Amino acid sequence: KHYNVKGKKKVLVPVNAKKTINKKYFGRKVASKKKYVVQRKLRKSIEVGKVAIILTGKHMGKRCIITKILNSGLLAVVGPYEINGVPLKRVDSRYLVVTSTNIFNFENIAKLKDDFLNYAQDIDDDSFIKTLEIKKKQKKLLKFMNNVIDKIKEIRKEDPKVQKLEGIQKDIGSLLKPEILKNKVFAHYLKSKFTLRNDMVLHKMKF
Amino acid sequence: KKRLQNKNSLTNFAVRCRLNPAYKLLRSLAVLRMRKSILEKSKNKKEKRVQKQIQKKELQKINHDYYKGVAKAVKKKKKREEKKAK
Amino acid sequence: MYKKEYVIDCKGHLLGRLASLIAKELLNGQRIVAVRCEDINISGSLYRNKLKYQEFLRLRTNTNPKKGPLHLREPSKILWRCVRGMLPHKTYKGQLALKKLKVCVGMPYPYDKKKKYVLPSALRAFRLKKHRRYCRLGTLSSRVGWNYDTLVKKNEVLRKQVSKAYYKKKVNNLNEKKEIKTEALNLINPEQRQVLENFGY
Amino acid sequence: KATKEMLKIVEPYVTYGYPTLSTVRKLLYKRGYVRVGKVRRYARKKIQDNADISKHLGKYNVHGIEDMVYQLYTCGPVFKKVNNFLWAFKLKPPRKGFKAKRHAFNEPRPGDWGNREAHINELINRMI
Amino acid sequence: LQAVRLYEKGVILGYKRSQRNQDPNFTLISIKNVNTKKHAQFYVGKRVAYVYRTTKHHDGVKIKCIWGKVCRTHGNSGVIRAKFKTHIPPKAFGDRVRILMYP
Amino acid sequence: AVKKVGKIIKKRTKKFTRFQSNRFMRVKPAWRKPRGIDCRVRRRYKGTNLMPSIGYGSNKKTKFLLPNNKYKYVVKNVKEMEPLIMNHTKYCVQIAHNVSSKKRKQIIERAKQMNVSVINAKARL
Amino acid sequence: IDNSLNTNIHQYHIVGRAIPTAKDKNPNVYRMCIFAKNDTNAKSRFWYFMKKINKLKKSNGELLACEQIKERFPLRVKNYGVLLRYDSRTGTHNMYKEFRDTTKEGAIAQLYSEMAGRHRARASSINIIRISEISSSLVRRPHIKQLLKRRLRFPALHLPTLQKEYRKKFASKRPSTYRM
RNA sequence: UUUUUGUUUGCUAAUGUAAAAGAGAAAUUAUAUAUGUACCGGUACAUAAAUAAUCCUAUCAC
RNA sequence: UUGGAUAAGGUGCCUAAAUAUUCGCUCAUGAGAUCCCAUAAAAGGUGUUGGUUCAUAUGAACUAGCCCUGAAAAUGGAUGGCGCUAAAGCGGAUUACCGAUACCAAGCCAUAAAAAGAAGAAAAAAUUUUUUUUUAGAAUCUUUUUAUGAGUAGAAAAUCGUGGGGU
RNA sequence: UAAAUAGUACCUGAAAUCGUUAAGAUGGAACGGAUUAAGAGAGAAAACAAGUAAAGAGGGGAAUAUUCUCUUCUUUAUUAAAAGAAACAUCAGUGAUUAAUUUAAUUUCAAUAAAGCAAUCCCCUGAAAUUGUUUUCACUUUCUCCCCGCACUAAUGUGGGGAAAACUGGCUUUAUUUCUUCAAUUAUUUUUUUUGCUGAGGAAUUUUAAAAUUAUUUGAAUUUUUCUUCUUAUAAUUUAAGUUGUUUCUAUACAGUACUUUCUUAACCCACUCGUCUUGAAAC
């Protein structure tokens, strides 16, 4: 579904009304009268195999390759764990500065694109959001120090969705790694963290 | 009636349409105009040039005439000055 | 003005403008060391400047000159005063800014080994037409009783020799580095080398 | 003639000129507020809908904003009434600012209060 | 190297101001090597954080931060106005601020 | 400044203190409106105390709502408690300052039965 | 196109005439070029001039035509002679000045500045009486004659006007005004 | 001096920073020219001439 | 109240905004610096900068800008200060910007006026039925709309509090 | 003694003023307002958890003494949810940016590569014989050449006097326009890159009706067009018909260093003793 007003063609996505609001002089009603919310529509630089810098996460500054446009707007990113250390990580388009460099532009890695695409497709949206039960379990560990952390980690590992995600990541790494390694400079770049220095003006940067 | 927003007509397409119904047609026309390829426009330029010649000449004559008049005026002024001096 | 401490070489500058430049920076939040304050130039003719100074001196407090306008006659001191004038020094922020400024005659202990900066929008060579009269601040100071001018000059001269010595060594080092670079450019990797060449290095 | 005289009398306090059609339309659209109610109790209501003006200006064969705009542009059979109906356009200050409100537009130095016949539209656009 | 920058450095200057009228609603920010209006505009949507240290711990820490949005450029010389979640303390007037790369 | 919490907007959290109440003991903070020539406050010079004015008033809709969103109702007795049986989500009980402890306890008990909030349950607790 | 260099003085050909009357069916039409910043200003100037010269006022006449004249060869250096009438604080004077420029409008702009600067003559107080292109054999003013030199050459002693990007208040090494 | 943990009866364990995120950068001098170098301030030869629009220094964990 | 955009004025720093651009003019051994405004004159000037009129590239006479002289009072001293001369001076022009409680857009408060008013299930959460909220109708009242809001002397209205009385 | 900080100056015991303690501040006032801040106190009635279950302590009401049911506190655990604050996204309102775009109109142009046309010539512009017009000589280069000065120049040149040409320029052409041009300023239009602030209200029939949009269906039109328009009919949607959604966080908390708020100093900016008579009071 889409609407084409003034020549924009905006594309609609079905949404659910969650918030309830008190009526003027009787019983409450749902806040949203609208049933379809216009899709995000990402910038004209976000692709499928470009390398991006994560600005805000724990892996702050790491250079990770983009994976899947994850339909919910925010995209999936991987810095092939066995090379960069970035896991199968969901991220918003804003918290990633995408570089003009594309992986599938290199002569060596371009041939393994279809497989990558397939893998990306296989990854889903609901496989990221942790179900409440897991959260509850995690919380339950609060009531020594490092032991608690360990327990939390274990719990995280246990999650079936999480396991699946991990597996997917591993598969991706297997697919991609050797080629990346072979392009040594590229590999190094992938590994390294992007840092601003006393010469990099940012506003004149075309990266 | 409870006042709602006050919706910009010039932008909010629907509102604009409501205000002025024929507007849609106009918009369509504009779009169509925008559409046409630049080659045609380029071609038309030659035609325009061809058509313009006489007009251009006329314009030149007019402007030339004006210039001449100005010159004459200047000359007259000079003459007057000379006379005064004398 | 995002540096830790800016050392400003005050030679060849035009006083008031320089002061103005300093003041804003100070306000913003920058430690400024105005060094070599004997060679700051004033845009008026020397005599005129002297006269002005005299006039200033004359305006003292009538009841008790222990208070009132302190006529600090050291060039650095003068500069400092000027800077203060262009500041809201009666508040707290202003005071802080003032404190942040440090003025020196010639070059002392640490500010010989630190990089000396120049303010191009305040230079005498860029702000005065070369048919107008200018005045060296040190000379002015001497005229209105400073005494320690010759000594300062001598010190400066001495320092210059040292600088020259150091400079020679630096030059040599640079040359060596260049040589090394030349040698090693062939020892890297072809593509990498090419890339380096492309990007100027 | 009378209008002209009036303008002259208040020349140094106003800027005026010939509005051009597009500008007028714009004014009607973004800044066009209208008086809706029984005479002397008006209420400043933004147009938005044609039924809002079709009640008062229905007798004079001018339904819709477009008609009103047309009337404004060229003094038709019914223009004065339309003008009356329209609330005084509460405009912004110019986005690039005035030259000088004290001096005239016709003054050789930068000014404003003259009869800017062809630049009035521009001014309006700036302050729309 | 321990720790990665990823932000442009800045100085949280005065409030938006007349000659003698305050306006605490906007702060003025000087961004390192940006000297013109055009350059300033690049940073317009970026997020700004004033991070500061305190003696008493709070959410278990000595460092807290106030966030802002960067609203508009400010006059010819690359300065920008920033609006913050809560107004900045004027103790901050000579302090450093961070302008992040996100949005 | 303004103090938004929920939809509850408070325009002026600061109390308007009497002019010079801070200068002479004999002048209490309780707002009094200054009269007479040369007031400075009356004249509204920059930098002085402000004058309370009708602009400051809270939206007709949320006015006497407390942070809880319930209008406070003072309660001296069970009988009074009763008018709010059909209003537990809109009025919240405060027990009168002069109520004896037993009576207060009783009132509290009643409130709990009614599901009505008590804003001062802890007095003499 | 540059928007900092431009001076918005244009030249307008204006034609107008007094409204016809029963007693004077065939009035006389008057034309002039007027140097002014916009078209309305030009018109006003024209009206003023009419008032000064003949019995005519804007109220009893009508503008017949307003043209706006663009320079025909806006990239050809030309030597302009100008005649002016100006008012000082002490009285009124006629004068002739010469300006080497690329358009009449530009010359006018130059002239206005010159009068402002050298005589403290404000725009209001000046009346341009004729600007015409002078051949190089009739150049009377030395500051224009000099320019008209054969293979003219001069060095560039002017101070660099850096862009407010590459303008910094702290400099590494003391800049040089010498250049070359 | 090095290490560890901390500064989460008026007291007797104890916190503060107008400014860390690479807060990097030592010729000198002239401004209608300077700097070296080599001889005897002079001569000859180089060299800077948008000079921080630069250079240096980063990420190569195990 | 929030955001915007201006006005007068400014934009070297104090001081938010130009050491902006652009063309001139000024050097002062007591420069000059913007309405009211906080003063300067007659008369000069082979100071420089333009001009005009004349004469044979000089000699005149004039003329007007800036500048200089004329220009001397008492506490110390005041373009507001610092300072400023390729101005940050004077006269322009060109942009850009900053800049009010003025303007615009939005909210809320009051006042004024205007519309208008003597019957009914909505949703969510649970698991087809329970639970959670409301389920309005107070005429100086309720709902909505628009405009407006300075104020001494003064007038009025609505409230608020104190001592007692009947209820 | 119930109570002596009810001890006969005796009920309550305010303020000024003073003492002790603590905290803080302090360069010729102090206080204050506006806005934060860091402290230091306070707090939970929005600032999370309804209910369900197991079993204690209580209380009730009803049905016809003891069945039922309603509950308030305690607990062991057990799932909500909502609520605010973020962040991002989507609208809409109002703005700030940097790119543009339509058909025009207004003596614009500029290249292209072949023909030419005239040499003080041409587009022009001068000086001369009320507008148009006739002719007069005046005006371009040059790294060209000659003669004089013989390197005389700021100049890798030159002062002067002369020659040359059409490379330069100008015009006239034949075509050409992404090699480069297609301006500028209005006219009328159509977008777009970033983006800041705002979200009021809650519509028992004007939160409808229409507009718009999507997929269909009938008939037309000259603007032959995947946004072509009207219109016959049907569903849906939002650009209508003022902000909702997603994910965090507070937090699986009962108060903590978080959150609220009172006080406290700071700090930036401002702020002159009130009353009073007065044209006018901060008034020496």
Ligand SMILES: O[C@H](c1cc(C(F)(F)F)nc2c(C(F)(F)F)cccc12)[C@@H]1CCCCN1
């Ligand atoms: O501002 C002028 C001035 C002052 C002083 C200072 F106060 F620093 F000594 N120095 C000045 C100088 C200085 F000598 F360069 F410092 C030159 C011109 C004027 C000066 C004086 C002040 C009194 C009135 C005008 N002349």
Ligand SMILES: O[C@H](c1cc(C(F)(F)F)nc2c(C(F)(F)F)cccc12)[C@@H]1CCCCN1
């Ligand atoms: O106007 C009706 C009405 C009727 C009657 C009755 F007829 F019973 F006396 N009395 C009313 C009253 C009443 F008089 F107070 F009883 C007030 C308001 C409306 C009334 C309203 C109509 C709406 C529903 C409530 N009664």
Ligand SMILES: [Mg+2]
């Ligand atoms: Mg202005």
Ligand SMILES: [Mg+2]
């Ligand atoms: Mg008075």
Ligand SMILES: [Mg+2]
């Ligand atoms: Mg008084």
Ligand SMILES: [Mg+2]
């Ligand atoms: Mg405002």
Ligand SMILES: [Mg+2]
């Ligand atoms: Mg502005």
Ligand SMILES: [Mg+2]
């Ligand atoms: Mg400033």
Ligand SMILES: [Mg+2]
């Ligand atoms: Mg001075």
Ligand SMILES: [Mg+2]
């Ligand atoms: Mg100034």
Ligand SMILES: [Mg+2]
């Ligand atoms: Mg009033």
Ligand SMILES: [Mg+2]
């Ligand atoms: Mg007792």
Ligand SMILES: [Mg+2]
């Ligand atoms: Mg007692």
Ligand SMILES: [Mg+2]
């Ligand atoms: Mg008693």
Ligand SMILES: [Mg+2]
């Ligand atoms: Mg007693």
Ligand SMILES: [Mg+2]
């Ligand atoms: Mg040719």
